[PDB]
Amino acid sequence: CPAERSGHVAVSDGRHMFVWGGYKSNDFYLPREELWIYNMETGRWKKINTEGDVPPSMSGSCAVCVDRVLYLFGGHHSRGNTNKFYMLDSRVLQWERIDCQGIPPSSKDKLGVWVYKNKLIFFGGYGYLPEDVLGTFEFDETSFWNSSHPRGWNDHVHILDTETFTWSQPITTGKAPSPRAAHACATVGNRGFVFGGRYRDARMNDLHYLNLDTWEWNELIPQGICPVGRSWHSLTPVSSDHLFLFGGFTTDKQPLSDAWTYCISKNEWIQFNHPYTEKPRLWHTACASDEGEVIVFGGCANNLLVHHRAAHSNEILIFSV
Ligand SMILES: CC(C)(C)c1ccc(CSCC(=O)NCc2cn(CC(=O)O)nn2)cc1
């Protein structure tokens, strides 16, 4: 039922997948008030129209679902990037914009988030120069000609404490990943993994994790064959020991349909064979089910940067991992 889209968000409790936002070609954004719910057990869709402080229609936003409470940060609306923070209690649904304390992150999109205890921990993204902070920001030289305000990538780590809805920045040790956007984040225990992403002229192949207890960065160097570097991929925990990688976009502008699992305990990648080899996706979403499956929705089958030829999808791809 839902219309095709890329750059949407999809979050889940393992049974119901909530889809919001994104854009398509016919860069018209999809209706801001619509919240699509996909039942992973029955395969049925349901649309509900939300009220309250409905966020602007956006692509590249960052969302999480914790105890059936939906949190949304950042994104790109018709007038640029944002750093607003929204909440939707899904337990008539009403959005609520939270006026957080502390210094918020810079306005940006295409980032990632880890969830650990009371903390939402955001990393990276693409957006405007920080108006103020810890980390590094690198301008995208091409942004000075295609836009009113220039933009760049960051390697910032920001915590939102949901106990007080206060922003802060942790003091991290170790070598942080370079600034990036369109990377993929995944959390298992107190480890926030990040893989790939776009930085300058490369879509990268490196894998790191941030210890969310000690705030120490670690680079992971798996031995043997590793997936090609990419952006606009998904990285989804499917167990306490495996992360599922699917899709994305290479430095060479190749849409990707390969799937892998990263085994955390063995520190190796395992390529996953599946029936969607002719169905590459970039800027899709991926959500894990309680039954071990990974549910991919939306995204684009070809180079979405050629807008007038972009092949956005509304297909559900089910990976039984
Ligand atoms: C309007 C139209 C539909 C044509 C459209 C335009 C632009 C975009 C995004 S491109 C601009 C940008 O924000 N560049 C920084 C960036 C990119 N990436 C991902 C990667 O390049 O792999 N990570 N950081 C998408 C659609």
Numbering used by the authors: 28 to 53, 60 to 124, 129 to 169, 171 to 359
Question: What is written in the article reporting this PDB entry?
Answer:
As a substrate receptor subunit of the CUL2-RBX1 E3 complex, KLHDC2 features a KELCH-repeat propeller domain, which can recognize the di-glycine C-end degron of its substrates with a nanomolar affinity. We set out to identify compounds that can anchor to the diglycine-binding site of KLHDC2, which has recently been suggested as a promising PROTACs E3 platform for targeted protein degradation.
Out of these, 29 compounds were successfully synthesized and characterized in an AlphaLISA competition assay, in which each compound was tested for its ability to compete with a diglycine-containing SelK C-end degron peptide for binding KLHDC2. While several compounds showed detectable activity in displacing the degron peptide, compound 29 (C29) stood out with the best IC50 of ~ 3 μM. To reveal the binding mode of compound 29, we soaked the crystals of apo KLHDC2 with the compound and determined the structure of the KLHDC2-C29 complex at 2.0 Å resolution. The triazole moiety next to the carboxyl group of the compound is nestled among three aromatic residues (Tyr163, Trp191, and Trp270) and stabilized by a NH…N hydrogen bond. The interaction of the compound with the E3 is further strengthened by a hydrogen bond formed between Lys147 and the central carbonyl group of the small molecule as well as direct packing of the tert-butylphenyl group to the auxiliary chamber of the degron-binding pocket. In contrast to the two ends of the compound, the dimethyl-sulfide linker in the middle of the compound shows poor electron density, indicating higher structural flexibility. Overall, the binding mode of compound 29 is highly similar to that of the diglycine C-end degron with a binding pose closely matching the prediction. Finally, a high resolution X-ray crystallographic structure validates the predicted docking pose for the KLHDC2 ligand complex, demonstrating the effectiveness of our method in lead discovery.
